[PDB]
Amino acid sequence: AAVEDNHLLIKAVQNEDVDLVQQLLEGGANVNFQEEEGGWTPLHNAVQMSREDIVELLLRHGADPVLRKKNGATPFILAAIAGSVKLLKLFLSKGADVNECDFYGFTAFMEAAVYGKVKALKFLYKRGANVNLRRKTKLRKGGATALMDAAEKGHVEVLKILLDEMGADVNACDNMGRNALIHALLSSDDSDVEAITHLLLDHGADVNVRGERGKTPLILAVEKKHLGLVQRLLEQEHIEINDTDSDGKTALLLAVELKLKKIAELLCKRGASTDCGDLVMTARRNYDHSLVKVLLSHGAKE
């Protein structure tokens, strides 16, 4: 009955129907209603759609400015996702703390990085957001940072702003031991990965970090089948061409097994032919005789 009206209020907000929102609130609908599934409120929804006027309407009807939903997100944090500087500023005047976080450790600054909201990022920075915070949950899915988020998501401009203008530590690691370089290679679209990797390497990113399963940047690039990345990575002075993953396989072995001749040949022109195992055998069983030629030219065995 009244529970129906409360959902109508949220629906009215979602539909951006101001008159209806007013009528329902003046009707006695619970302004702080939380839908049971996600804990969302009319205010959360209003913020998500960047409707400042609807937000102010809800606030004037007594909406709790800092009421969190199930994941712990506040309207303030949602404002960062929406990329709204005005709303971010608004909730800071309402008691929000610039460094507060949802139950997964996500702060506003991180959300801005995740969603590539440049203006929100810059505003939150000047408000004294801790740029280098590592996420505190309440798994080995934590310890991440805004820089890793930007790298993973491919937001090149944000990544630069963090590295150049905001003192982001390029070599911080999450709980899994992964750094921004790893995150960029793990998920970033092939569209932005080269530029992001280039930027990180220039800023002193450690090429010899171990990710999940002992995977290194070099190995991840090989598994990406991306020749450009492998080439860029090998240009690093202190790169370990012979590092092995948990399975004890090197970048070259994987290149051969993955049937990548050009990448494998690149690795040979600098790497180690025996450290990885029976390469010629693998290349031959795959009918790649051209690769067998290269491997033998570099001292492969049988």
Report the C-alpha gap between 101 and 142 in whole angstroms. 13
* Helix/strand/coil percentages in the chain, nearest 5: 50, 0, 45
- Residue 162 exposure: Cα atoms within 13 Å on the Cβ side: 35
Assign a CATH topology to domain 1-302: 1.25.40
Number of C-beta neighbours around residue 270 at 10 A: 11
Give φ, ψ of 101 to 5 degrees: -145, 155
For residue 20, the SS3 value is: helix
Report the C-alpha gap between 158 and 211 in whole angstroms. 23
Resolution (A): 2.4
Radius of gyration of the chain (CA): 25
- DSSP β-bridge partners for residue 250: 244
Alpha-carbon distance values, 184 to 17, 107, 189, 193 (Å): 41, 20, 9, 6
Number of C-beta neighbours around residue 49 at 10 A: 14
Q: What is the DSSP string of 240-275?
A: -TT-B-TTS-BHHHHHHHTT-HHHHHHHHTTS-SST
Report the C-alpha gap between 82 and 71 in whole angstroms. 17
**SS3 for 185-249, per residue?**
HHHCCCCCHHHHHHHHHHCCCCCCCCCHHHCCHHHHHHHCCCHHHHHHHHCCCCCCCCCECCCCC
- What the block records as the tokens of 283 is 């290349």
End-to-end CA distance of the chain: 79
- What the block records as the tokens of 5 is 């009206």
Report the C-alpha gap between 22 and 33 in whole angstroms. 15
The experimental method behind these coordinates is X-ray
- What the block records as the tokens of 24 is 């329902």
